[PDB]
Design a protein around this ligand. Structure first.
Ligand SMILES: O=C(NC(=O)c1ccc(-c2ccccc2)cc1)N[C@@H]1O[C@H](CO)[C@@H](O)[C@H](O)[C@H]1O
Ligand SMILES: O=C(NC(=O)c1ccc(-c2ccccc2)cc1)N[C@@H]1O[C@H](CO)[C@@H](O)[C@H](O)[C@H]1O
Lengths: 810, 810
């Protein structure tokens, strides 16, 4: 049908059809008489998977022969989503498969909807790892993603009575056609025990053993015949485990609970033992695998020349003392040489400055679970603090500030401090974030070792986030400038010379309208909700957090509603306001925010006077597959975190690439997006970082805003009195109290500028031609935010490897 | 190489080789450079499995079109063993695969050894179910095996310091290529809750739900293109299970524990709740499947015309009240009609008369777990006892003896009494066993309903138990009488006309010698033990039980040793005495018996004066795959249970078919074996059932035997004084005490006749020609004990269906 989806050759279509029928028969053990749509999905999945195999085997043998430096990306999260369409895109198989299935009497899009998301992440951090894997393969790097194969990923969100309910994400129920179990590469991981000091070194003894079994998933590069590996560890009890008899067998579950479920608390660090076990489990198994591969090439001097380990946040920070443990206790290297190797091997990426999110493990936990690692951490701390004392003599307070060990009620290890000490590179994820790291939380560390601190602005893969989810837009772009932009996104700048092109303006606007119509139909078919497709699609999708200020959005919605009620016969630009995202199960305020959103919709959507002019919809179960649907349909992207709180954001970049205009604060990557597009082509409002600092010095008094803004006073009075909860008048008392007395994120302070800026949005939308021209200016300057650019920067400035766009033979 | 293994055609060998290479590449994702022997096994398994698929699909569609009466074999155990060689045999693929793998540079026998046994049974009862499935497929019956997919089967036995140690049988670790998951056929099973009585009947409400997910395994008939199904249920938590958040997800394990492990206690009934859940789980899921299939053909009058349910012991006895529950509570049939349907549908097979093995479930367990089933059982009991009272008026004691409810300390339900009341047929498993049922434990029931009671003498499949395990013997037989005996074992009688044939005598003896050499080599290669292959192979392999009298065997061994020590320079026929079998984990006396056997070997095998004349070996981890090895190598089969205790035995039949002579009591199927072969061709000794009864009336006094038999006195004195345990002199005090004071199985009473009979065995073995002629007389009359005969009798006399040897089109 469309060009970017590839060729549908006679030979290929015929071959795909027969391999499909072969899999339906031999693999699924079915005939066309008894086959369900799920059977048809699996037959297609297996057919496409067959095309990966040859390339997968030859890519790995290529790395063995050439022996390049290997990149190991360690993450507790890989938010992959669906794999089928992505594989077809990167293999240029999409049109061929579409044709093959069509001739078999099947609709491929219907079959694609049957695949479960691999929801092995919470949000931005997990999704970044996934985009990175795609870019590393596309850039021909010898890269491996290492993590945990959770049996249950991020919970499925159900909304019951306006409240979030959680249900287990049993994503493996029907099987996973993409993974290959490698039980022959199973590795032991040790826990508990005690440390014995012998004549010839320390020994970790009397440990409990859990087995780590790897599952490999192929990661295809974009049409370069490269297929890299994501290796995920599963927990297994050894066969003599606990070995009255019946209970011993049942108790094997305890060991296997390690890889059972993803922790969904992305807001607040809880020192839970099971999480600590997960963190060490992935680290210990991964590092044994790394060392084994390095030996199968005695001299660990060359280790950092052949190995780079990237730590995705502090979650795999135990890699630092674990590498020291292996080098010192097992390989018998002296401390100083082992430390040199470790530092040159490891690099650390930070993803937030919010203190409650930082991992600080109680010493008593590490003492019991990992006694030898604690000893190594103490030794790292002493040697590090000796360096600090020598550089800043007599500065006793610096010494306590920089210590890896935090004193107090319970002693704790600051894992971020560990990561900085044990890494040759530390990066933030957007320019403003990286500067904030150097100026505030890691200031002392920057003063000691300035050369360590870098920026690597985040990105998203244009394969999933344009070609896959928005083929209509990808095609109209390709008509003008060819196809090379898909793996060289900077080429989108060429679209600037089409900003006054009447045909292109019409096409850009047409694609958006089609996307909006398709999504409006999805909402009716799957959720029986009715929306006006001619309204402005105002969307905020992301995890529910106070710092992300979904609450500020809510105040604007109520403002709009109140203004309509005040002057009903006045014209307003119609809006569909969509808010979606999951709340961490223990985050009470976030769960109240969800209830508020649904409560507002309950009032707004049923007011006859409002009509089709304003609709408020909560997008249920927001996840990667839903993002791929809603983002192409958006007109307005809400990126309204308090300045200095969102490290980067990546949703922002997805919207920019897909033809939405952005209303946002100067926070995270928003700053760089505005810089690339031009501030005139961005809806910027609110306090900057400097303004927030000034308000903090003075003291933030929310009452001041309540007193001086009549429209805001009305909203608070409506909330308090039970306007949005008639049968439970005080339901939202916690929300009002927080806003009035303990709002860390200054919602009221940005209210006036936000409402004003929103009026400027509505004004522009009334001028369809000028709206679309501003959109073209955004798409055309979105190139910087390709994860190909981000990864090329990591490769050159941290890992010391050169990217390559060259093909491997097919 | 050999004829019975089929053709190795050019076309077939070429095709197998390319499908093997296809599976190694696409299925296993390996090349010949990195492939391990396990990879090669799996590639072969998948290649052979491909040949089953077409036949499997067409067999099931044939049953749909023809709609014959369906047989449902309900068992908690299916002791399947390995599947690869069995599949090749039944498909006539063995020589072709051997050739195909040979040309690829591989040894098929080596690859076969890599497959894990499906050890989903304890012993004879579980193995009977497996032989039955093979026979039903071979006889073209529309049969389904229904059971539980245990994650862990019978434990692997390790011998440490002469003691049994148990380790988990993680048989699914590397995956199972033979099964196909059918998550689309998942069914709910209910537990706990309460009964509500409404205007329009009883309702079972407020239940906890566990999901039952089926896995189908193909069961191929012998070269008839029939492939039947074994469906095994796996336990799954529903997705809203327990749905702080983390623990709720972890608690899903509790539901899934139902299908986790096989209960290994084949000796003594324990009322464990988890076992009760297993029993109901398989019954509830199976019966929903049955009814669904019956409807997909309103009128339950025809139900017994289209459905037969065979209960393998009382373990699935809950099928009776569960069928009543569905018919009455759900389908709204009246009690009397539902009961008529149930009785005509169900039949029950008993496997033992030992009272401690009988299932008697505490009422309080059924009250909590299955409240509605208890109510139905009480109602069944009342109506049944009303019939008893009407037939035998005034016989109050009969009423209490026949009651399904047993009074006492704890009230219990007698599941055997339930089974007889709710079945149109009740059978024992050998002629003497079935007579004992009518005369003793079920006497009252036989007097009420004599027409219900039948015999169905057990059998074994000649495919696994001759062709597969002893191809050398199968071939020399086929040379003389052709191949038709493999599915018509009665044809072996033709071998009687070769009893004086010098060539055949030489061949029969040659095959045995080769088998003995091969097994002697297996023992060195895998266990580093050294045996004389020219000695008589004296073997007793079976689960360790007091009634099976491994202890009597031990007394003979010590007698032989003592006689050698008394007269060292006297000639004795050399023997290798092999004893093997697992003990139930809680069975203390059985574990002591194992220790005794190893302790005897420790003394005997290291006495220089003995030399190669006597060796005592404990066969570790006895299981189906080991049986296939040791049975063809045996000269003497020990079947020495106390008369009236072994219901049938089936090991006895395996040995007879494979050229061992039998020393045994007149117990179980031994009686019929002696009858078929002639008592002159069998080594019969000891008390008959009548003699045991006489001794019980009088009182069994073991002291009498100790006082009057000097050779027995010596042994007991050796045991007591620490002769076999020098460092722990009183180690065997429990064994001596039991023998002297509380021996339920009269070991001393059969001692003299046993030793005497054993002398007659040694005498015959000295005459190789006459030994072999007696062997030929045994093989030639073993035809009755084919499970094809047993199943044809079930089909005609219980299920009301006609067997067919006709081919389905390929
Ligand atoms: O998504 C993020 N974090 C998480 O999801 C998260 C997930 C898990 C934890 C966690 C930490 C310890 C124990 C248990 C859970 C903490 C945070 N961070 C985001 O990362 C993106 C990629 O760099 C940024 O764009 C975004 O600004 C940032 O908030
Ligand atoms: O093997 C047998 N029984 C078992 O393995 C068995 C297995 C499990 C249980 C059991 C019953 C209740 C709870 C838990 C376990 C009871 C008995 N019985 C044997 O059956 C053969 C086939 O008919 C006979 O040849 C043999 O004589 C008999 O002992």
């Amino acid at each position: 049908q469309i060009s970017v989806r590839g060729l549908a050759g006679v030979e290929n279509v015929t071959e795909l059809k027969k391999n499909f029928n072969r899999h339906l028969h031999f693999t699924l053990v079915k005939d066309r008489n008894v086959a369900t749509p799920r059977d048809y999905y699996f037959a297609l999945a297996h057919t496409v998977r067959d095309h990966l195999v040859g390339r997968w085997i030859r890519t790995q043998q290529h790395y063995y022969e050439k022996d390049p430096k290997r990149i190991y990306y360690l993450s507790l999260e890989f938010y992959m989503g669906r794999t089928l369409q992505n594989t077809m895109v990167n293999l240029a198989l999409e049109n061929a498969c579409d044709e093959a299935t069509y001739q078999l009497g099947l609709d491929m899009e219907e079959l694609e909807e049957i695949e479960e998301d691999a929801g092995l992440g919470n949000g931005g951090l997990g999704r970044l790892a996934a985009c990175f894997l795609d870019s590393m393969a596309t850039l021909g790097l010898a890269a491996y993603g290492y993590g945990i194969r959770y049996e249950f990923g991020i919970f499925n969100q159900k909304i019951c009575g306006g409240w979030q309910m959680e249900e287990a994400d049993d994503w493996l129920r029907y099987g996973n056609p993409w993974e290959k179990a490698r039980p022959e590469f199973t590795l032991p991981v040790h826990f508990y025990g005690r440390v014995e000091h012998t004549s010839q070194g320390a020994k970790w003894v009397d440990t409990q053993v859990v087995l780590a079994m790897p599952y490999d998933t192929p990661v295809p590069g974009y049409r370069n015949n490269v297929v890299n590996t994501m290796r995920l560890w599963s927990a297994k009890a050894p066969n003599d485990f606990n070995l009255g008899y019946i209970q011993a067998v049942l108790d094997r579950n305890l060991a296997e609970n390690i890889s059972r479920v993803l922790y969904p608390n992305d807001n607040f660090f809880e020192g839970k033992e099971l999480r600590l076990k997960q963190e060490y489990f992935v680290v210990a198994a991964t590092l044994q695998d790394i060392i084994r591969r390095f030996k199968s090439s005695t001299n660990f001097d060359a280790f950092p020349d052949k190995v780079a380990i990237q730590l995705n946040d502090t979650h795999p920070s135990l890699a630092i003392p674990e590498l020291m443990r292996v080098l010192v206790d097992l390989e018998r290297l002296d401390w100083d040489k082992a430390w040199e190797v470790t530092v040159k091997t490891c690099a650390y990426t930070n993803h937030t400055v919010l203190p409650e999110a930082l991992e600080r493990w109680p010493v008593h936990l590490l003492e019991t679970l990992l006694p030898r690692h604690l000893q190594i951490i103490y030794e790292i701390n002493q040697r590090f603090l000796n360096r600090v004392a020598a550089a800043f003599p007599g500065d006793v307070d610096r010494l306590r500030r920089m210590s890896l060990v935090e004193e107090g009620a319970v002693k704790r290890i600051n894992m971020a401090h560990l990561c900085i000490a044990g890494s040759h590179a530390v990066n933030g994820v957007a320019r403003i974030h990286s500067e904030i790291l150097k100026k505030t939380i890691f200031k002392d560390f920057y003063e000691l070792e300035p050369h360590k601190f870098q920026n690597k602005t985040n990105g998203i893969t244009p394969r999933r986030w344009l070609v896959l989810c928005n083929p209509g837009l990808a095609e109209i772009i390709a008509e003008r400038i060819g196809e090379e932009y898909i793996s060289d996104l900077d080429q989108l700048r060429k679209l600037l010379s089409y900003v006054d092109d009447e045909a292109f303006i019409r096409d850009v606007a047409k694609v958006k309208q089609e996307n909006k119509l398709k999504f409006a139909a999805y909402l009716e078919r799957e959720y029986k909700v009715h929306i006006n497709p001619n309204s402005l699609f105002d969307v905020q999708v992301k995890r529910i957090h106070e710092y992300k200020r979904q609450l500020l959005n809510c105040l604007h919605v109520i403002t709009l509603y109140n203004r309509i009620k005040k002057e009903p016969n006045k014209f307003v630009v119609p809006r569909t306001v969509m808010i979606g995202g999951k709340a961490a199960p223990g985050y009470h305020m976030a769960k109240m925010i969800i209830k508020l959103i649904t409560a507002i919709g309950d009032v707004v959507n049923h007011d006859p006077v409002v009509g089709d002019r304003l609709r408020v919809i909560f997008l249920e179960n927001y996840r990667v597959s839903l993002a791929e649907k809603v983002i192409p349909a958006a007109d307005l992207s809400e990126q309204i975190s308090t300045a200095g709180t969102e490290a980067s954001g990546t949703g922002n970049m997805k919207f920019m690439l897909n033809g939405a205009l952005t209303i946002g604060t100067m926070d995270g990557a928003n700053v760089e997006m505005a810089e690339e597009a031009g501030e005139e082509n961005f809806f910027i409002f609110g306090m900057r970082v400097e303004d927030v600092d000034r308000l903090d010095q003075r003291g933030y008094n929310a009452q001041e805003y309540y007193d001086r803004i009549p429209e805001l006073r009305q909203i608070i009075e409506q909330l308090s009195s039970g306007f949005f909860s008639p049968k439970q008048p005080d339901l939202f008392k916690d929300i009002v109290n927080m806003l009035m007395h303990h709002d860390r994120f200054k919602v009221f302070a940005d209210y006036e500028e936000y409402v004003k800026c929103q009026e400027r949005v509505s004004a522009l939308y009334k001028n369809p031609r000028e709206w679309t021209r501003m959109v073209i200016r955004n798409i055309a300057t979105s190139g910087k935010f390709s994860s190909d650019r981000t990864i090329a920067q990591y490769a050159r400035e941290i890992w010391g490897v050169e990217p390559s766009r060259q093909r491997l033979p097919a």
